[PDB]
Symmetry: C3
Subunit: 306 residues, 3 copies
Amino acid sequence: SDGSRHSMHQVLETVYGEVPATPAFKRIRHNSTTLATAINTLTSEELRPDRNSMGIRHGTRQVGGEIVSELSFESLDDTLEALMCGTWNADALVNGVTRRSFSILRQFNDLTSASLPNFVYVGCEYNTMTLSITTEAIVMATFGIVGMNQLEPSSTVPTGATFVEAPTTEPMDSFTGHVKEGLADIAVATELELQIENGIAPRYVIGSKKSIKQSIGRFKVSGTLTAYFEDATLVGKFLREEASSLEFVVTDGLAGNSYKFELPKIKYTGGQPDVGGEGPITLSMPFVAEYDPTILGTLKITRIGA
Amino acid sequence: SDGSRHSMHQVLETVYGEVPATPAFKRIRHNSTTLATAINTLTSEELRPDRNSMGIRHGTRQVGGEIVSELSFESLDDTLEALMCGTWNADALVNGVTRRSFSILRQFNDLTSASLPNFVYVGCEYNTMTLSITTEAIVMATFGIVGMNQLEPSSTVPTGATFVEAPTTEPMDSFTGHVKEGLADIAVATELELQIENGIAPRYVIGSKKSIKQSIGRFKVSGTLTAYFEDATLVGKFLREEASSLEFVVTDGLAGNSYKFELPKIKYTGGQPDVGGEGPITLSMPFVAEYDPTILGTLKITRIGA
Amino acid sequence: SDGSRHSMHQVLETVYGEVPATPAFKRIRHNSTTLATAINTLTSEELRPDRNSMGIRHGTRQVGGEIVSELSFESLDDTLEALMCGTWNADALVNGVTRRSFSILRQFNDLTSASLPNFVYVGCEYNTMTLSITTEAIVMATFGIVGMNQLEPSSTVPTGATFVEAPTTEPMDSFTGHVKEGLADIAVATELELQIENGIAPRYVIGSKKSIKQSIGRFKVSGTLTAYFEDATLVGKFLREEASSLEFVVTDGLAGNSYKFELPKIKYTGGQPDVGGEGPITLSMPFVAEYDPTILGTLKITRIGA
């Protein structure tokens, strides 16, 4: 099979670890994927006179895959909602406690029917998200999922596997960036990085070969902010304890639709200006987001889409 | 000295740690080497007002060297026999227990007589072996050895150091149409990797700068198999518990002489088809070999040489 | 700010952690520096029902700067004296105990006055030194320091910040015909590496954000010596316990002035002639220096400057 002809679809699960009766598989616009499963190994230490390798025994299997997707409007909304464990309300999303389990199907168009091109992964729950914003570079959102187990390859797709398509809105660009840092101050930051962690780990019991359930952890928001040393206001906020805020907006290709990420309470963990021989002096300022009561959360994503 | 004018000769030892009376040093066709000795250090911890470095003391020594050689017929047979710890029988070798110690002599041809070019190592025992098979790439067998101690450089070669030569048979290539994976199924694997370990470790006692003996460890045979995702049979064998077999034959060339490696019982530890950004989908399937009572061993090398 | 317009100065402190009344800031000849402070984080482990980020707390702070400078005469002299903890006597320096603290000032000429270009670092103490000598390559000396805390950026320089300029002499070259290894033997070594460690670690107490003092450790001198395998005398000094000496001099074109580094007692920790396929055979021979009572120290730097 080749990476050129591949299709990926997902459906919200009503019962954990099972595909719905008529799965509404939805197309997932993406670039590269590593979704797969991992099986444990129980080695045998039986003594052998000829030192012959005794062998190993298989163990519980867990689906683990990382998918890379470009940020765009009318897309990745379910992924963000499930990851934030919240609900899209008034085009605004806040980190809450609403876990969502999905069933992802990997269909290899190039693979023939007899070759079983359908690979179904169930119990898949979004766990980690990586957001990177670089000037003149498409904004991409990497997604890490925790799946309970995978089904055997089969020629026939899941019964009633309706394949919904994904709106192909122009990918978001880094221009017209509303990068705010103070109460009303606009920062001169060049790149911006955001990481989201749900801390979802699996739980195995006697007589099971998969994670009956996945233990979610605390919602964690952190990131890295890089700017130029030309601005000296960023310097000091790290030296002296100061709680600033972060607020940036990704721009579409003049489509009139856009998002808005806001971190009301953050504190700088680092920040060091280095001569670095010749050339302009940069400034990397990693930060740690913390719970803010005004929004009853740590992060708030808002769609201003037209 | 330069690597161009370099040669290595080895002789089977009758008494461990000693060169035989009339060593039949045999030429070892090789590419590069890292064979040498390592001496431990015993630091001294004593308080000093001037805070001056107290000093460290030399400890036990261990000869450790890695030798890279291209796989070819009528060559490396003694290395394979010694490593496998078995004995060549009917052009077939199965992992045994018989341990063989050798004495390796490094002779820098460019180095002058007064410059002491001869380097002698005693107690050298083959510990590990790395076999890599790549398409349109010569098959090379890497060899790791464990020696007791290195003899001081001298001008005169060991008394009666007869220098036997090695048959310069054409290096084994990868152009074979025989790579078996099932009972009669021929696999479409692209590269194949095999690793062998003897778990040999040295033993130290009071009043001995060198290792008197080496406690041999369990015989270990494992490997990695990479193929194309086009074949879907291998896919799923990782997910389910299945014990397959591996059987591949390196081809010397037009001459009928060839080597046959067989692993009667293996199981796959991993396996993952990744779409990636673009291009074809590959498939890496690591495996671990296990004891098969039919051959009363883990691996069986067979020469079909004409 | 850009790395093109930056000035770095320093002044000997009379009281630890404080800039002198009128600092005689002296130009620091260097290629690049990383002078900056680092603050620890105290995370809060309070369980939250909405699983929100509790937030972290700032902890103690310390200043670390990497001063990369090119070795040259009439320069880094105070740096060498402070690092060696000795006193320049008869143009000869021996590892002593007397500790020296300095106040480093980084001035970004390009940064405007209102932009607060002056950066002051107090309690800076030279700790590590890395000297590398390569043929047809300028001798470089890296300087690691341990500072107490970083003063806030201000427009006005420290009161009476007289800016002395270190004498600028042609950088030292590797073209010397004097590299001694035996009692009178001249070695054929190609590169030479020297590392100096003072073991300065910071000390924290209750109610102090900064380190009140630094408990210095013992003086540590070690290095690495690389040569060619053409000389077989170096071989064996590692195999059989032998205590040699090292003595090398850096040259300054036709200026005449020079530095002389001497290690009266060293022994070699490694040594390995590697064939490496083709080309010449090199020989890396790491060594550790120790206490020699003839000089009452480990290392003795001597200026023969005209």
